[PDB]
């Protein structure tokens with residue numbers, strides 16, 4: 001009855017990282033950088049806004065737990081001051097909106113904890129998880145969960161299509177967004193799952 | 200330890216409406232028209248985009264139930280084509296954002312049903328319910344409930360403040376939004392409730 | 399020697415209306431609702447039989463002309479099925495029927511045109527314009543003029559009193575009647591004029 | 598311009614031999630329009646009545662001969678003004694057609710003089726109606742001023758449209774005495790109904 005919709009690099013496991021708490025600063029394969037406010041430069045450093053993957057592995061300093069799934073999470077970090085805009089990840093899927101279907105989008109959202117190289121990761125920028133059809137946002141979870149420092153929680157976004165939806169046949173999309181509402185303005189995501197069930 | 204946050208005209212019971220299925224075309228008292236795309240004119244007619252209150256009482260042609268609370272609901276109707284923008288209701292409260300507090304916003308959202316002499320009320324434009332602090336959207340439910348033709352369902356939006364939140368001491372706010380993602384592009388709200396509970 | 403008999407609100411200009419195609423749903427001031435079949439309720443809505451005044455200004459969707467006189471017209475719309483009865487406007491004048499006098503009553507009658515979101519204004523219910531003395535209809539034009547969609551035409555009713563008329567000294571009166579013989583079952587009136595002239 | 602057929606349109610049936618003589622029974626081809634039961638089944642000279650009258654050479658009642666042929670059709674109502682209305686009705690075989698301008702004409706007579714001590718001064722008012730089914734499409738309710746001893750031609754106009762509700766219903770004619778005043782007799786003659794494209 002309930003069907004899994006394929007998503008590329010849904011657990012950010014690509015690329016493989018060898019040393020715990022190491023990370024990349026380039027867009028994860030299979031994802032695009034959602035950049036409506038042009039906060040993330042094409043060429044990144046550890047100083048600029050950036051995104052990529054990080055290995056949340058045995059004895060990680062940043063969390064009270066391992067990655068929700070496999071080795072890695074996907075992160076978005078924004079250097080600009082709170083209120084300067086939003087950015088994150090986007091992926092347009094091969095699947096299209098079908099009529100009389102219940103879509104359930106689940107993503108794990110992480111609030112980084114601790115102190116590293118004299119930098120405090122206390123605080124949280126807010127998140128939004130969006131399900132798209134074309135570039136319409138069908139349904140979204142704008143920051144409803146409370147996520148304690150050093151944990152992940154599962155966001156759930158749901159849409160139900162009717163027989164005559166205007167967006168039928170448009171490609172489904174997912175956006176994972178750093179709201180940059182506060183500092184520390186890094187946000188982690190993991191284990192994106194999307195299911196469809198005929199109504 | 201749960202506390203009610205007072206909201207003016209929270210069930211749109213002002214003004215009194217005498218005749219079932221009658222309605223106003225002016226901003227309900229205590230509310231303002233959220234109008235970021237200027238879709239709703241200053242001077243409204245029965246022919247234009249409009250908002251107001253509407254009596255969903257015994258014998259309603261619009262619903263398979265009465266108003267969620269009292270006699271009336273607040274409606275926002277947009278005449279423009281899907282994707283023209285959004286509009287709805289906004290109210291800024293006296294209450295301010297306090298630390299270590301779980302805020303819970305609930306609102307009933309209505310999908311109007313039926314026909315009238317060639318007019319069709321089938322379909323639904325999408326909703327979003329927002330909790331604000333100042334100009335910031337702290338949390339929002341963007342269209343996650345599926346709502347059948349001729350029913351209301353309760354949307355719940357939640358935010359939890361920490362001790363160090365950047366928006367502490369700013370005025371809480373509520374926005375009820377017609378997404379205009381499809382037609383028929385009327386949307387109803389009722390029974391707005393906001394509670395605050397120390398963590 | 400042609401004298402014009404004063405009629406209150408003869409051109410439906412009270413009340414003043416700001417917005418083109420806006421309208422009241424209350425009997426126009428100076429008039430009463432002629433309601434022999436009780437088709438028009440005391441409290442009217444968008445969904446009921448109604449009457450009132452309507453602003454036909456530059457840009458109106460209803461007519462290929464402006465109002466015959468000033469800004470406004472007086473309208474009567476009947477929701478009930480054709481054959482259900484008649485309704486409209488009546489005004490009893492201060493003037494009385496005098497002997498050996500030619501009476502000329504003129505009124506412009508409007509047939510609405512067009513379409514609104516599935517609603518059609520195509521068709522016309524028939525009109526009757528009546529000159530009264532007391533409760534007696536002295537003369538009436540029952541639907542003799544062909545009125546094209548989106549235009550007004552002038553109806554003229556004539557009565558010549560003799561020295562021995564049964565009704566001498568009775569109060570003159572005017573009735574503007576929606577016949578409800580077909581649909582669309584709204585029609586409009588404007589610019590009511592009554593003159594008296596010694597024979 | 599098409600002539601729509603009407604039976605006994607001139608009230609020429611029945612033939613009357615003596616000038617100013619008359620019948621007191623419903624003219625052939627017509628029915629008595631009687632919504633208020635003012636006219637009895639059995640009529641005398643004292644009751645409300647209807648019939649035909651020979652307005653021939655030297656007629657006492659008019660300044661002219663019948664508008665058409667020998668006879669007119671009359672309606673007289675004995676009841677007091679305001680008691681109601683009565684007259685003649687005929688349903689035709691022709692039915693309402695769209696995009697058509699219908700013109701109904703009838704001459705309407707205001708009887709004059711004194712006869713056996715009765716004054717015919719005054720006039721009850723008239724209404725000429727065009728019908729489709731039992732709907733009055735159009736009517737002249739007493740718009741003409743008719744002088745004592747004259748006939749004047751009443752004209753009733755209706756224009757049909759493409760989606761008229763009454764398309765295909767039988768056309769009909771009513772000639773009505775309004776009983777608004779006395780003397781409360783009313784005469785008609787020369788009923789003509791034409792049709793032409795819009």
Ligand SMILES: CN1CCC/C1=C1/C=Nc2ccccc21
Pocket residue numbers: 046047116119186
């Ligand atoms: C030098 N900068 C800019 C601010 C944060 C950052 C990091 C460098 N390594 C990191 C590892 C984990 C989280 C943040 C950083």
Ligand SMILES: CN1CCC/C1=C1/C=Nc2ccccc21
Pocket residue numbers: 021022023053054055056062073075076077112186187188
């Ligand atoms: C916020 N930033 C900036 C650079 C890397 C980083 C991480 C966020 N979560 C992480 C988990 C594991 C390793 C690194 C990061």
Ligand SMILES: CN1CCC/C1=C1/C=Nc2ccccc21
Pocket residue numbers: 220221222252253254255261272274275276311385386387
């Ligand atoms: C969508 N619109 C436009 C005008 C009023 C209307 C209503 C919506 N809900 C209602 C409930 C009761 C009465 C009217 C309305």
Ligand SMILES: CN1CCC/C1=C1/C=Nc2ccccc21
Pocket residue numbers: 419420421448451452453454460471473474475510584585586
């Ligand atoms: C048929 N109806 C019912 C409600 C209003 C209306 C109008 C008719 N002519 C009008 C001219 C101007 C404004 C409104 C109307």
Ligand SMILES: CN1CCC/C1=C1/C=Nc2ccccc21
Pocket residue numbers: 642643673712715782
């Ligand atoms: C005896 N009565 C009472 C009512 C009218 C009448 C007439 C008798 N012959 C008539 C000839 C012409 C007109 C009227 C009458």
Ligand SMILES: CN1CCC/C1=C1/C=Nc2ccccc21
Pocket residue numbers: 617618619649650651652658669671672673708782783784
């Ligand atoms: C008003 N009444 C009642 C009985 C006869 C009648 C006539 C009316 N016109 C007439 C013309 C010629 C002859 C008789 C009548």
Ligand SMILES: [Ca+2]
Pocket residue numbers: 011012013067068069070071072073190191
């Ligand atoms: Ca992972």
Ligand SMILES: [Ca+2]
Pocket residue numbers: 111112113121122123124149150184
């Ligand atoms: Ca943190």
Ligand SMILES: [Ca+2]
Pocket residue numbers: 210211212266267268269270271272389390
């Ligand atoms: Ca309410």
Ligand SMILES: [Ca+2]
Pocket residue numbers: 310311312320321322323348349383
């Ligand atoms: Ca609906």
Ligand SMILES: [Ca+2]
Pocket residue numbers: 409410411465466467468469470471588589
């Ligand atoms: Ca006017």
Ligand SMILES: [Ca+2]
Pocket residue numbers: 509510511519520521522547548582
């Ligand atoms: Ca029309």
Ligand SMILES: [Ca+2]
Pocket residue numbers: 607608609663664665666667668669786787
């Ligand atoms: Ca004849």
Ligand SMILES: [Ca+2]
Pocket residue numbers: 707708709717718719720745780
């Ligand atoms: Ca006479």
Ligand SMILES: [Mg+2]
Pocket residue numbers: 205206207208209
């Ligand atoms: Mg309150």
